[PDB]
Amino acid sequence: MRVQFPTTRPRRLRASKIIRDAVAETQIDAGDFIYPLFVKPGGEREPIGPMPGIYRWPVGRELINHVEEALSLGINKFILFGVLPDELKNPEGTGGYDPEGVVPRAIRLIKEIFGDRVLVFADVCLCEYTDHGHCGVVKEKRDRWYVDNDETIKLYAKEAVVYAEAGADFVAPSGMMDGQVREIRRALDAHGFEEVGIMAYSAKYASAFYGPFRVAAASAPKFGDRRTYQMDPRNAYEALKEVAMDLEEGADIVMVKPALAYLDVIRLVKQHFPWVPLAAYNVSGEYSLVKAAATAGYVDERTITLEILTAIKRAGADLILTYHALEAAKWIKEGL
C-alpha cells in the first residue's frame, strides 16, 4: 500500500455511518448463528448458575417457548446437549447410545412438530454421560490413566447412528479423539445415512472458557485434565493438521472452539481452506464474561457482544455457535 498522506486520508471512509456501512468488510445476521439447547430427561426446567438467562429445558412444550420463539427471530438451527443426573452414568457412557434417551427424544420431538423448518445439530460426546466425566472410556493400564482412543471412537460411532435414526440432520463430534470423523462416517454410511452430515469440533482448545458449560451440562472430570486430547492453546498452526485430517475423513463443516481467544486461528484455518465452510463456537464463558462485566457495571452489554460476534465472522467464521443468538438477533441496528 504505496498510497500516501495527505493525498490519501483513510478517514474519508469513516466520516459517516452511511459510509462505514457501505465499505464495511464483515457482516453478521441471524442466519449465521446456531443456538445451543440444553436438554434434561423430563422434569422441571432449571435456571443455570454461571449462564444468566440460559436454561436446561425438559423435553416438552418448552419447545413452544423456545424453538418457536427462536424461529420467530431468525435463528433456525440448533445444537442439543444431554445433561444427566449422576444415577445413569457409567464408565463407558451408555447414556450416549440409548434410543429412549434424552436427546434422541428431543430430536424426534423437535423434528416431528417442526420438520424441515429447522436443522438439528447433535453433540456427539461421552463426557456428558460418563461416571468420571472425561470425553471417553478410560484405561487404568498398569502405568497411569488416559482416555483411550480406539475404543472410545466406536462409542461415538454408535452415538451418531442413534440420532441419525432419530432423525437429526447433523452429528458433530467434540471428543477430540483422533479418527472420530472417520469411524463416524463409516458408521452412518454403513447404516444408510449418507444423507446425515458431520460438523467436526476439529480445533477444540483446552480452555478455561468452558467453566460455565461444565456446570451447565454435568460434564466435568474427577481427575481434572483435558490436556491430552484438547489442543494446546499455544498452537495455531497445529490446527491446520487437525482440520485437514477431519476433512479427508469426510467432515462437511469444521470448527474452532472457543472463538474469541482464537480469532487468529480462525483466519489461519479459513485462508488455507477457503472452499470449506467454517463454524466457530462463541463458547460457554465468552458469554458469562460479557454478562459478569455487563451487570457488575463495566461494558455496554449490547455493543460488546455484537462487537465480539462481528469479530468472529471477520476472522472468517461462516457459522457461529452462540448461547447469545436470541438476545443478539433482535439486535437489528448496530453501532459499528
Catalytic residues, by residue number, are 204, 257
Identify residues 209-268 at the interface with Zn ion (CB under 5 A): 242
Whether the CB-CB separation of 201 and 176 falls below 8 Å is answered with: yes
Annotated binding site for Zn(2+): 125, 127, 135, 178, 242, 246
Should residue 76 be labelled a site residue for a second copy when binding is judged by CB under 8 A? yes
CA separation for the pair 274, 220 (Å, rounded)? 35
Question: Of 4 and 115, which CB lies nearer to Zn ion in the complex structure?
Answer: 4
CB-nearer residue toward a second copy: 124 or 290: 290
Binder among 186, 220, 327, 331 for a second copy (CB under 8 A): 186
Span near a second copy by CB under 8 A; candidates 36-44, 53-61, 96-104, 261-269: 261-269
**Residue 158 neighbours by CB distance under 10 Å:** 15
| Nearest-approach distance from CB 160 to a second copy, in angstroms | 14
Minimum distance of a second copy from residue 257's CB (angstroms): 13
Report, in Å, the least distance between residue 198 CB and a second copy. Answer: 8
Helical pair 180-190 and 149-166, crossing angle rounded to 10 deg: 40
Q: Any idea what DSSP says for residue 286?
A: H
- State the nearest-atom distance from the C-beta of 62 to a second copy, in Å: 20
Closest CA to 257 of 200, 299, 218: 200
* Pair 265, 239: CB distance under 8 Å: yes
Among 45, 182, 220, 327, binds a second copy (CB under 8 A): 182
Distance between CA 239 and CA 231 in Å, rounded?
A: 8
d(CA 41, CA 185): 28
Contact with a second copy (CB under 8 A): which of 61, 223, 224, 237? 237
Give the one entry of a second copy, Zn ion, none that residue 159 binds, where binding means its C-beta sits below a cut-off of 5 to 8 angstroms depending on kind.
none
- 163 close to 122: Cβ distance less than 8 angstroms: yes
Q: Specify the stretch interacting with a second copy by CB under 8 A; choose among 87-95, 115-123, 124-132, 216-224.
A: 115-123
Per-residue DSSP letters for 118-186?
A: SEEEEEE-STTT-SS-SSS-B---SS---B-HHHHHHHHHHHHHHHHHHT-SEEEE-S--TTHHHHHHH
Of 119-148, which residues contact a second copy (CB under 8 A)? 119, 141-144, 146
Nearer to Zn ion, 23 or 296 (CB): 23
Window 187-226: contact mask with a second copy (x via CB under 8 A): --x----xxxx--------xxxx-xx------------x-
Number of residues counted as binding Zn ion (CB under 5 A): 6
Pick between residue 69 and residue 300 the one whose CB is nearest to a second copy.
300
Query: Between β-strands 77-82 and 55-58, what pairing exists: parallel, antiparallel or unpaired?
Result: unpaired
CA distance linking residue 278 with residue 256, whole number of Å = 8
Of 76 and 174, nearer to Zn ion (C-beta) is 174
Footprint of a second copy on residues 297-336 (CB under 8 A)? 297-300, 303-304, 306-308, 310-311, 314-316, 318-319, 335-336
What is the DSSP code (8-state) at residue 131? S
Which three three-digit cell numbers place residue 131? 461416571
Residue among 309, 267, 264 at smallest CA distance from 287: 309
Q: HSE on the CB side for 56, CA within 13 Å? A: 23
Relative to beta strand 319-321, strand 33-40 is parallel
Alpha-carbon span 202 to 185, nearest angstrom: 15
Instruction: Work out what residue 127 binds among Zn ion, a second copy, none; the CB cut-off runs from 5 to 8 Å by kind.
Output: Zn ion
**Residues between 162 and 181 that touch Zn ion (CB under 5 A):** 174, 178
Where along the sequence are the contacts to Zn ion (CB under 5 A)?
A: 125, 127, 135, 174, 178, 242
